[model samples]
Target: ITQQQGATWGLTRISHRARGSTAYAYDTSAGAGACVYVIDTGVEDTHPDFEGRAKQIKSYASTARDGHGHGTHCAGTIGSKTWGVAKKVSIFGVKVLDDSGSGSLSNIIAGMDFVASDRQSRNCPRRTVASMSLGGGYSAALNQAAARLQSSGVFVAVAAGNDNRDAANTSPASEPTVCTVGATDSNDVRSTFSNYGRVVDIFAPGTSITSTWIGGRTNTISGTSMATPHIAGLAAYLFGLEGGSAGAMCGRIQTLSTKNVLTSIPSGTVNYLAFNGAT
Candidate 1:
């Protein structure tokens, strides 16, 4: 367990429960036994930030192939060597979105099914956690797909969307099975662009977050997109510690979350801020 210095503000914030932090600290394990499936644009597994820990599981989009850069960024936040929550976790890219960060609902569902199918077929020791940063209007099929995946023992983390509206109308975000995540800034204030309401399970640092990008570069972006992986990564960290069903894993995340620290959350939203069990 290294005490990581010069870490991103996002990583530094969640590693500890306090308001201000300088370094990211965690156990040496750091999610070595877990695998995160980034169901977004695509990932640049070759990025040095990944340290050979990222792999392209499959692609549903024609051009995203790391072209959109969104997937890579979120993946970095999930488990890049430097800008990640689970430093040792392996990232598997499930490219559901096109280069423009858009995917047909069926294509998205296709990716979800594959993640569960892959996990079942492999039946290996690695626990699976899926990070979905994309969302659209209400869709029963989409929520069902997420539920199906979760029922198969894979925990799912989803962005609450950047629409600044109620998250209840969004498919998987509104879905009861998966963990829906909102965005908070460095000041512990909810990001204005983040959707809220009862559907959002927890808030994570998301404003001006830095992470790995295409071409082996780094970039700073803001959105619920950046926030979702923080929870996904944290969920993976927990999974690495003890392999559990999605129900158990999701509950532990809520139980361990720091409460009443955020300001101006929507009326229906809970004030649970994501934490990694650090002091």
Candidate 2:
């Protein structure tokens, strides 16, 4: 431990001090007003913590400039800026996996119909949050493109596949209107390589973790693809804790996740439900 005790351990130190401070400890909204579309397999976006923070990066992969680094390591675990959890959140890249990160479920449903036709053909205001660690098991054409981008609100966070199986019945994350993330174990347990059900709605800090990679280093991968970007950087830190319905910001990160827990590996157990103003 001790990289500040492995970054405040457990539920990743209250979202790494709520994105390094003040984006919320009482809202101040510099979450760059929220945006996250990331379709994966292309995003160098001139990396440097994505200077000036990326916005419309589309690619639909024909070979998204080979670097096969897993879409810039899941876009630096969903937004990296000198150590990110939500580092001023605002990223939009759609590559449709190639450079060998894999693709084709009809080109990941044409990168989910280009973020559901970007607010209907490029008018895009906000309300975007699609982070996928990728999976394939229950597909009615990727759950009808995650049920047509979760019926227009467009908040998806999938990746229940590192194949420890189960994945709470995977497939566009068992599509109960998508948002299934599971993997925990920095003593927060669960991760023996996670995959549970009750349509799993939470669990973060996926194993050995660390993050960001694309020539400019910081690697340390593990499954549940590092716990689906700690639930997509806690849904952009619950949009600075109060930004109208993305199912009420995923019910304020499913009520600041904590769950009935136990795991310093004394024989695991964790029953989750924390995420309401966290700790």
Q: What TM-score would every model get versus the actual structure?
A: 0.96, 0.30
- After superposition, candidate 2 runs with Cα above 4 Å error: 1-50, 57-76, 84-91, 94-110, 113-138, 143-158, 161-165, 173-182, 191-194, 197-226, 230-279
Predicted structure 1: lDDT: 0.88
lDDT of 1 by residue, 147-220 (tens): 99988888999889888999988878889989999999999999989899988888999899999999999999
List the candidate 1 regions with Cα displacement exceeding 4 Å: 123-126
Candidate 2, 77-101: lDDT as tens digits: 6666544555567777788878777
Error of 2 at 99 (Å): 31
* Alpha-carbon lDDT, every model: 0.88, 0.62
